[PDB]
């Protein structure tokens, strides 16, 4: 399924090249450039466990998720992954626990040492 597709075909976008954040672009953005670090980014997403269990979707509440890019307001994989995206892009990310919620997890939805899958749409981004 999509997590296995990313395991098999995804790009390692980590600086450590530790396969901690793997990416596939699913829809190329019309946007030409990535956001800058510090920019406010607006995303839609769906987040699943690596076994395909959906744990959330922002489309369920018509509510984009907004954060300041690169500021540690979100899991590391998102700061890393969304920084590679262009406006309008949809990607898939697969995120090792070191780049997500680690040993502690985030119960009930996220177990200890969970590898997480996201589909992310970069809707827009704005200056800091």
Curated annotation (Swiss-Prot):
Acetylation impairs ability to promote interaction between Akt/AKT1 and PHLPP1. Deacetylation by SIRT7 promotes interaction between Akt/AKT1 and PHLPP1, leading to suppress Akt/AKT1 activation. Ubiquitinated, leading to degradation in a proteasome-dependent manner. Deubiquitinated by USP49, leading to stabilization. The modification N6-acetyllysine is found at residue 16. It is found in: Cytoplasm; Nucleus. Induction: By androgen. Changing residue 16 to R: Decreased acetylation; promotes interaction with AKT1 and PHLPP1. Widely expressed, enriched in testis compared to other tissues. Residues 30-118 form the PPIase FKBP-type domain. Part of a heteromultimeric cytoplasmic complex with HSP90AA1, HSPA1A/HSPA1B and steroid receptors. Upon ligand binding dissociates from the complex and FKBP4 takes its place. Interacts with functionally mature heterooligomeric progesterone receptor complexes along with HSP90 and TEBP. Interacts with NR3C1. Interacts with Akt/AKT1 and PHLPP1; enhancing dephosphorylation and subsequent activation of Akt/AKT1. Interacts with IFI44L; this interaction modulates the kinase activity of IKBKB and IKBKE. Interacts with IKBKB and IKBKE. Immunophilin protein with PPIase and co-chaperone activities. Component of unligated steroid receptors heterocomplexes through interaction with heat-shock protein 90 (HSP90). Plays a role in the intracellular trafficking of heterooligomeric forms of steroid hormone receptors maintaining the complex into the cytoplasm when unliganded. Acts as a regulator of Akt/AKT1 activity by promoting the interaction between Akt/AKT1 and PHLPP1, thereby enhancing dephosphorylation and subsequent activation of Akt/AKT1. This is Peptidyl-prolyl cis-trans isomerase FKBP5. The lineage of its organism: Eukaryota, Metazoa, Chordata, Craniata, Vertebrata.
């Amino acid at each position: 399924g999509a997590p296995a597709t990313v395991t098999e075909q995804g790009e390692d976008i980590t600086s450590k090249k530790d396969r901690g954040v793997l990416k596939i672009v699913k829809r190329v953005g019309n946007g030409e450039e990535t956001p800058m670090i510090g920019d406010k980014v607006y995303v839609h997403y769906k987040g699943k466990l690596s076994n395909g269990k959906k744990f959330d979707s922002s489309h369920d509440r018509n509510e984009p998720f907004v954060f300041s890019l690169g500021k540690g307001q979100v899991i590391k994989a998102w700061d890393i992954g969304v920084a590679t995206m262009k406006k309008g892009e949809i990607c898939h990310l697969l995120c090792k626990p070191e780049y997500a919620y680690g040993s502690a997890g985030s119960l009930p939805k996220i177990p200890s040492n969970a590898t997480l899958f996201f589909e992310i749409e970069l809707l827009d981004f704005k200056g800091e």
